[PDB]
Each structure stands twice: as structure tokens, then as C-alpha cells.
């Protein structure tokens, strides 16, 4: 059979790389339970406004999160499924 | 909530393994069929020692498991979490905008 194309692999690689950051993953653990404002997230991570709004505004262009203060959510059902499966599998321990 | 720092770090380490093109190419194959290192190496066009070396961290972080059949060792996606992780990340990559 065929492996996915090298270009497809490299992009999929780049997408997992952004997930390979514990601070990002902390934000996403919050968005996993509900949509939340720019300041509700900062108050959970116990940091600032102008800095949650740096990381989120990063994750937006990465396609992990979306926004409508602003409200953030997990972009869509792939993101939700991906975060949960990863975190349940790690939990099996 | 927010997951604990320790838990976030372990999860970041799981995802770091997935952040390599070659390992993801291996996973794309195991997604359809349990395969040997020999089957894997033929399909990708690399040495076998090259596969085995890539498979190590896939084993250690439990992305893949293996069975023995006589002298053959056959690898699979560890479980349904791995199938979903993979498929969902590929579909989100190839979708919509
Ligand atoms: Zn699992
Ligand atoms: Zn998607």
C-alpha cells in the first residue's frame, strides 16, 4: 500500500508540533470543557490579558482554536476528538 | 480546571513523538493493516533499521503495539484512541479551509 505523501506528512508534523507545548495544552484543556472569554482563560491559567491573547491569537492561525471581549472555543469536532483521545489514552497509564 | 502541569508535560511529550513526518508515514500505513518492520520498510523505501529506530519512540509512548507470529513481528495502532487521533488530525488538515 501507500503511505501518505511526504508533503502531507510534513504538514501533519507541523500541526502536532504546535500541540507539543505544555502551556498551549493547558489552554486547550480549558476550552475542552466550554467556550470561554479571553479573561476567563487568563484567570484559570492565572496570567494576563495581553498574554492569553498572544497565545490564543497564535493558536487561531494554527487552526486549533476559533473566536467571536472575545470568546474562544476548540475550532471544531476534530480538535475536540483529538484532544480527548490523546488525553484519555495517556490516562490509561 | 486546566490539567496539571505534570500531565501537560506528558501530553506534550506524546505529541512531540507525533511531530515527525516519517513516524506519521509509518502510522498512515498501520492505520490500514498490521504490518512488519519489513513490510513497513518496503512500502516507505528505507532500511528497516530506519523503521525500527522510528518505531522505538512510537512504542515507548504507546502509539503502536505489536504481536508475534512465528518469526514475524506485526505492529498495529495501539488502540482506538490512536485511530481516532490520527484520522481526526488528518481530516482537519485536509478539509474546508
Ligand atoms: Zn488508548
Ligand atoms: Zn476540522
Swiss-Prot record, chain B:
Transmembrane segments: none annotated. Changing residue 81 to Q: Loss of metal-induced derepression. It comes from the Bacteria. Residues 3-97 form the HTH arsR-type domain. GO terms for molecular function: DNA binding; DNA-binding transcription factor activity; metal ion binding. Zn(2+) 2 binds at residues 92, 95. Keywords: DNA-binding, Metal-binding, Repressor, Transcription, Transcription regulation, Zinc. Residues 37-56 bind DNA. Zn(2+) 1 binds at residues 79, 81. Homodimer. The zinc ions are bound between subunits, so that residues from both subunits contribute to metal binding. Transcriptional repressor of the expression of the smtA gene. Binds two zinc ions per dimer. The complex of DNA and SmtB is dissociated by zinc ions. This is Transcriptional repressor SmtB. The chain holds residues 26 to 122 of 122 of the full protein.
Amino acid at each position: 500500500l501507500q503511505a501518505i505523501a511526504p508533503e502531507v506528512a510534513q504538514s501533519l508534523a507541523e500541526f502536532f508540533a504546535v500541540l507539543a507545548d505544555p502551556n498551549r495544552l493547558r489552554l486547550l484543556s480549558l476550552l475542552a470543557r466550554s467556550e470561554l472569554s479571553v479573561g476567563d482563560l487568563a484567570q484559570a491559567i492565572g496570567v494576563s490579558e495581553s498574554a492569553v491573547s498572544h497565545q490564543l491569537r497564535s493558536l487561531r492561525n494554527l487552526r486549533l482554536v476559533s473566536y467571536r471581549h472575545v470568546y474562544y472555543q476548540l475550532q471544531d469536532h476534530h480538535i475536540v476528538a483529538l484532544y480527548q483521545n490523546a488525553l484519555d489514552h495517556l490516562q490509561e497509564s
